[PDB]
Structure 1
Amino acid sequence: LAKRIIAALIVKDGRVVKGSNFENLRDSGDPVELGKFYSEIGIDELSFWDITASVEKRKTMLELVEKVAEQIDIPFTVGGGIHDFETASELILRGADKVEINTAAVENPSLITQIAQTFGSQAVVVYIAAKRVDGEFMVFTYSGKKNTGILLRDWVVEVEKRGAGEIVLGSIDRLGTKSGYDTEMIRFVRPLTTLPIIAHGGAGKMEHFLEAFLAGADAAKANSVLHFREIDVRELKEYLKKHGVNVRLEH
């Protein structure tokens, strides 16, 4: 019931892609050190998205999650090309709390159920990329390249039905901008599901996070706005608490 702030990190070959501005770190491109620091200054969860080339990817992702699990005591999610149960399983067993799936879920919705059977619904995060097409919200796969022709309304309901634990709602209309979260999209989805909704795409200033929670998001995920310190994590949580948002401060 508390709202969560989630730092998302894009990684490749064990490096934070495009790095970060925290000059206090020994290595500002080290995902484990950056992730650890984030947990120490108030981030509620981490999210890692891997884009390593296929031949080294499996091993690279497993090394990342094991290293992260050692140094971090907050929940974390891993994703990026997770296409089947076996891949999801190895990553959870090696240390991840949750996996994030999108394209493979749309093409085989029972993948949601198979992962949840073994690891519980809470281990399954479905990322839904959506955008407006002829006045309707539609689901997009393959990093936004493909219009599936599936209505957002229908996919959300199916996703909960198949046993997902959380939904990340990413607005292609906002990704790569700093104009704010897609609050209209979040409000559209909120009454359709009982699952936690994680907002993603468009974060630019602290007020955007307040707007997102008002819209009904249970968590807010953000990338470079945090890494380049356009927003400060502690200021953000102080700001949100100040304006009525239930965030956590202090075998």
Structure 2
Amino acid sequence: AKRIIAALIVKDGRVVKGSNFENLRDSGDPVELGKFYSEIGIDELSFWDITASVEKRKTMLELVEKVAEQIDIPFTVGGGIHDFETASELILRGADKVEINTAAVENPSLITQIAQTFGSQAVVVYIAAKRVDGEFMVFTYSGKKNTGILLRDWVVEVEKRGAGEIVLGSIDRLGTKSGYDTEMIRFVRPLTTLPIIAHGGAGKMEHFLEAFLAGADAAKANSVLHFREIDVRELKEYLKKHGVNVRLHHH
């Protein structure tokens, strides 16, 4: 089974750079846009917040509460989640999963701490990687720091610490529309039993097929969806056509 995940970069409760969906009352409203995606076949949403520190905590909690009210598919929230209490408030307020990267690399036990209370399934570790001198290396602080840690080693440790999913982000392909980094995905696939979410490089429908052939369990994309370079229901139809298994109350 494969998942298509829409990623929305948000700031001050707005979708950064908005969208091309003229049928929407507000093409820059993350809740309405997310709601719409859920109705046309997106399997999950992922929100990445870049609000300034002062209002950030409150803005992210308001976001997840509003989203959880209106949508029924799973969603992830991320962006500067650095400790357990921040992760916890967001999950309790409505998010299904939290995404972490830098804070996990600096304190791998953070993975375990969140999973202890909320289950491994609530913990998504984003791994940003790039080729450096012929090796896949792990990068932190939004791609600014080469940690010197090998991708191979961090993937294995991440599963060991109890993460539920890995987002595998190729800095080599980010923003290029040249396609997902399938060599990187194939490199990581045999190292872990966790679901792998491909991120970085999506430009056309065929890129998604290639990513799944590489062993990804999900594929995440941003502006190619919001600017409607790819249509969600067309993409699902296309994937199904070529043999990809795509899909189309607790007290």
User: Partner residue of 1:154?
Assistant: 153
User: Partner residue of 2:218?
Assistant: 219
Instruction: Tell me by how many angstroms 1:206 deviates.
Output: 0.1
Give the Cα–Cα distance (whole angstroms) in 2 for the partners of residues 32 and 162 of structure 1. Answer: 33
Give the Cα–Cα distance (whole angstroms) in 2 for the partners of residues 88 and 177 of structure 1. Answer: 31
Give the Cα–Cα distance (whole angstroms) in 2 for the partners of residues 176 and 235 of structure 1. Answer: 22
**Could you report, residue by residue, the CA deviation over 1:182-224 in whole angstroms, capped at 9, with x for unpaired residues?**
0000000000000000000000000000000000000000000
Give the Cα–Cα distance (whole angstroms) in 2 for the partners of residues 155 and 218 of structure 1. Answer: 19
User: Partner residue of 1:69?
Assistant: 68
**Structure 2 SS opposite 1:77:** strand
Instruction: Tell me by how many angstroms 1:104 deviates.
Output: 0.2
Aligned residue pairs, count: 250
Give the Cα–Cα distance (whole angstroms) in 1 for the partners of residues 100 and 173 of structure 2. Answer: 20
Give the Cα–Cα distance (whole angstroms) in 2 for the partners of residues 69 and 50 of structure 1. Answer: 16
Instruction: Tell me by how many angstroms 1:241 deviates.
Output: 0.1
**Structure 1 SS opposite 2:82:** coil
**Structure 1 SS opposite 2:166:** strand
Instruction: Tell me by how many angstroms 1:140 deviates.
Output: 0.1
1:180 aligns with 2:163: no
Alignment of 1:1-251 (within 5 A): 2-249=1-248, 251=251
Instruction: Tell me by how many angstroms 1:66 deviates.
Output: 0.1
Instruction: Tell me by how many angstroms 1:74 deviates.
Output: 0.1
**Structure 2 SS opposite 1:11:** strand
Give the Cα–Cα distance (whole angstroms) in 2 for the partners of residues 134 and 22 of structure 1. Answer: 43
Give the Cα–Cα distance (whole angstroms) in 2 for the partners of residues 127 and 114 of structure 1. Answer: 17
**Structure 2 SS opposite 1:241:** helix
Instruction: Tell me by how many angstroms 1:24 deviates.
Output: 0.1
- List gaps (5 residues or longer) in structure 1: none
**Could you report, residue by residue, the CA deviation over 1:132-185 in whole angstroms, capped at 9, with x for unpaired residues?**
000000000000000000000000000000000000000000001100000000
Instruction: Tell me by how many angstroms 1:36 deviates.
Output: 0.1
Give the Cα–Cα distance (whole angstroms) in 2 for the partners of residues 26 and 226 of structure 1. Answer: 18
**Structure 2 SS opposite 1:229:** coil
Give the ranges of 4+ consecutive aligned residues of structure 1 lying more than 6 Å apart after TM superposition: none
Instruction: Tell me by how many angstroms 1:124 deviates.
Output: 0.0
Give the Cα–Cα distance (whole angstroms) in 1 for the partners of residues 187 and 108 of structure 2. Answer: 22
Instruction: Tell me by how many angstroms 1:91 deviates.
Output: 0.1
Give the Cα–Cα distance (whole angstroms) in 1 for the partners of residues 68 and 178 of structure 2. Answer: 34
Give the Cα–Cα distance (whole angstroms) in 1 for the partners of residues 56 and 143 of structure 2. Answer: 21
- List gaps (5 residues or longer) in structure 2: none
Instruction: Tell me by how many angstroms 1:102 deviates.
Output: 0.2
Instruction: Tell me by how many angstroms 1:116 deviates.
Output: 0.1
**Structure 1 SS opposite 2:24:** coil
**Could you report, residue by residue, the CA deviation over 1:71-123 in whole angstroms, capped at 9, with x for unpaired residues?**
00000000000000000000000000000000000000000000000000000
Instruction: Tell me by how many angstroms 1:34 deviates.
Output: 0.1
Q: TM-score, normalised by structure 2?
A: 0.99
